[PDB]
Chain A
């Protein structure tokens, strides 16, 4: 039944499963694992949790291709369907690592991933929100936390930073937090209550 509680449970379960691989470094070889590896581990655990709870009818996970991840600035899309089989929400999730690639197009795509994610969310519409998920920070490299795009934008109207630096600035200064269950409690009934979340980050553990 309830879609929001299961998606929050699945996000917590996938973060707990991904915690094992964060901060791994082998100095006699390649230090860090790839960002795509961490994304795929997170998505595999999330999708298996959602399949076990029977919520696949009202939740769609679309992992973006390499072209799509380049163009949209997003690593995957979560589509929340309603009882009427219409789309009620779309979360465009871009992941970042804070412990530390066009390949086919002919450039005009000089923008950062922040500006591409913002342009993607502008083009889809008001029911498409942008979400940054951060795997690891300077100090405590196994911490996973989320940030809504509009909170960053509200900080950029003050700080005048570019959005890529503005996200990293937001994550290391914000003390206030909101849990992912509380953030996703609304999720269907009102759209703006997601984006008026304010100067907080999203706590996942």
Chain B
């Protein structure tokens, strides 16, 4: 059907949970088996937003540096970005300003960006307070969520907020 077809990219460092995030949103499941994405992949999900069907093609990128070129070759045509870090990994959070610069350099399209701190179920191993993440989100102009691909917390809410921002820019 699809009057609307939106291109979304999930980007961020390796091991923050990007593939797990996409699989939880698309198939409602989680496996602990870490396999690192080689290059880029995508999935298509259709949603009933406020009135009518919207088809999202969501591109999971690879976080490793050697694929940084090829993933940036797929930033064109993007209307939305999930910039994702890990709340148990400070190196992932220190990189998000570089990732936001990468979005502004290689993509812009005036595309909406949302900042997600994944693995919020791992509170015993938390290293980044939520206040730091929401302060940097206020600074960069992005919406902020703390999510868990493992426990399905704030996962579909983040995609819904990104799609709502994309629709509100029309």
Interface residues of A (CB under 8 A from B): 62, 64-65, 67-68, 71-72, 77, 79, 87, 104-106, 120, 123-125
Contacts and interface: CB of A to CB of B under 8 A. Distances in A.
B70 A62 contact: no
B1 interface: no
B70 A123 contact: yes
Contacts of B73: 123
A74 to B, nearest CB: 9
Contacts of B57: 104-106
A62 B42 CA distance: 16
A72 B39 contact: yes
A73 B69 CA distance: 17
Contact of B66 (A64, A104, A120, A125): A125
A103 B5 CA distance: 15
Contacts, number: 34
Interface string B156-168: 0000000000000
B38 interface: yes
Contacts of B42: 67, 104-105
Given A62-B38, A123-B69, 13 more contacts: A65-B41, A67-B41, A67-B42, A72-B39, A79-B38, A87-B66, A104-B57, A105-B57, A120-B39, A124-B39, A124-B66, A124-B67, A125-B66
A64 B42 CA distance: 12
A120 B70 contact: yes
B44 A104 contact: yes
Contact of B38 (A77, A105, A106): A77
30 contacts: A62-B38, A65-B41, A67-B41, A67-B42, A68-B38, A68-B39, A68-B40, A68-B41, A71-B39, A71-B40, A72-B39, A77-B38, A79-B38, A104-B42, A104-B44, A104-B57, A105-B42, A105-B57, A106-B57, A120-B39, A120-B70, A123-B69, A123-B70, A124-B39, A124-B66, A124-B67, A124-B69, A124-B70, A125-B66, A125-B69
Interface in B19-69: 38-42, 44, 57, 66-67, 69
A155 B42 CA distance: 35
Q: Could you say which of A68, A87, A123, A125 has the most chain B C-beta atoms within 10 Å of its C-beta?
A: A123
Interface string B64-90: 001101100100000000000000000
